[PDB]
Amino acid sequence: LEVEAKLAEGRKKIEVELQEALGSLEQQKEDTIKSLDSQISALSDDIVKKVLP
Amino acid sequence: TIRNSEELRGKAIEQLEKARARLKKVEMDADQFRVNGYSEIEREKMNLINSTYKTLEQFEN
């Protein structure tokens, strides 16, 4: 029981850790999407010079 | 008649004493069994927690 209940609580703690990590990653991804805009612009220009002959 | 009662009493006491000696021994086996079981239960509990912590970490992965 006691070990089992402890394990269940540990599983909940792991879920909290995992739930939080995903949220942090999502926030980071949003910032990146906001960030490195020049790549976007220049990145856009990117294909253009090589797409055609 | 005399040789009978004595034998009964001899055999009888050999047997009550023997039975109670066996009780003691068992009292010993059980005593042993209880300790082993307790240790096994603790290890098993340890098993569960450890492995579930592993499962957590894999979930995090």
From Swiss-Prot, chain A:
GO terms for cellular component: chloroplast thylakoid membrane; proton-transporting ATP synthase complex. It is found in: Plastid, Chloroplast thylakoid membrane. It comes from the Eukaryota. GO terms for molecular function: ATP binding; proton-transporting ATPase activity, rotational mechanism. One of its GO terms (biological process) is proton motive force-driven ATP synthesis. Keywords: ATP-binding, CF(0), Chloroplast, Hydrogen ion transport, Ion transport, Membrane, Nucleotide-binding, Plastid, Thylakoid, Transit peptide, Transmembrane, Transmembrane helix, Transport. F(1)F(0) ATP synthase produces ATP from ADP in the presence of a proton or sodium gradient. F-type ATPases consist of two structural domains, F(1) containing the extramembraneous catalytic core and F(0) containing the membrane proton channel, linked together by a central stalk and a peripheral stalk. During catalysis, ATP synthesis in the catalytic domain of F(1) is coupled via a rotary mechanism of the central stalk subunits to proton translocation. Component of the F(0) channel, it forms part of the peripheral stalk, linking F(1) to F(0). The b'-subunit is a diverged and duplicated form of b found in plants and photosynthetic bacteria. Belongs to the ATPase B chain family. F-type ATPases have 2 components, F(1) - the catalytic core - and F(0) - the membrane proton channel. F(1) has five subunits: alpha(3), beta(3), gamma(1), delta(1), epsilon(1). F(0) has four main subunits: a(1), b(1), b'(1) and c(10-14). The alpha and beta chains form an alternating ring which encloses part of the gamma chain. F(1) is attached to F(0) by a central stalk formed by the gamma and epsilon chains, while a peripheral stalk is formed by the delta, b and b' chains. In plastids the F-type ATPase is also known as CF(1)CF(0). This is ATP synthase subunit b', chloroplastic. It comes from Spinacia oleracea. The gene is ATPF2.
Swiss-Prot record, chain B:
This is ATP synthase subunit b, chloroplastic. F-type ATPases have 2 components, F(1) - the catalytic core - and F(0) - the membrane proton channel. F(1) has five subunits: alpha(3), beta(3), gamma(1), delta(1), epsilon(1). F(0) has four main subunits: a(1), b(1), b'(1) and c(10-14). The alpha and beta chains form an alternating ring which encloses part of the gamma chain. F(1) is attached to F(0) by a central stalk formed by the gamma and epsilon chains, while a peripheral stalk is formed by the delta, b and b' chains. It is found in: Plastid, Chloroplast thylakoid membrane. It comes from Spinacia oleracea (Spinach). Belongs to the ATPase B chain family. In plastids the F-type ATPase is also known as CF(1)CF(0). Disulfide bonds: none annotated. F(1)F(0) ATP synthase produces ATP from ADP in the presence of a proton or sodium gradient. F-type ATPases consist of two structural domains, F(1) containing the extramembraneous catalytic core and F(0) containing the membrane proton channel, linked together by a central stalk and a peripheral stalk. During catalysis, ATP synthesis in the catalytic domain of F(1) is coupled via a rotary mechanism of the central stalk subunits to proton translocation. Component of the F(0) channel, it forms part of the peripheral stalk, linking F(1) to F(0).
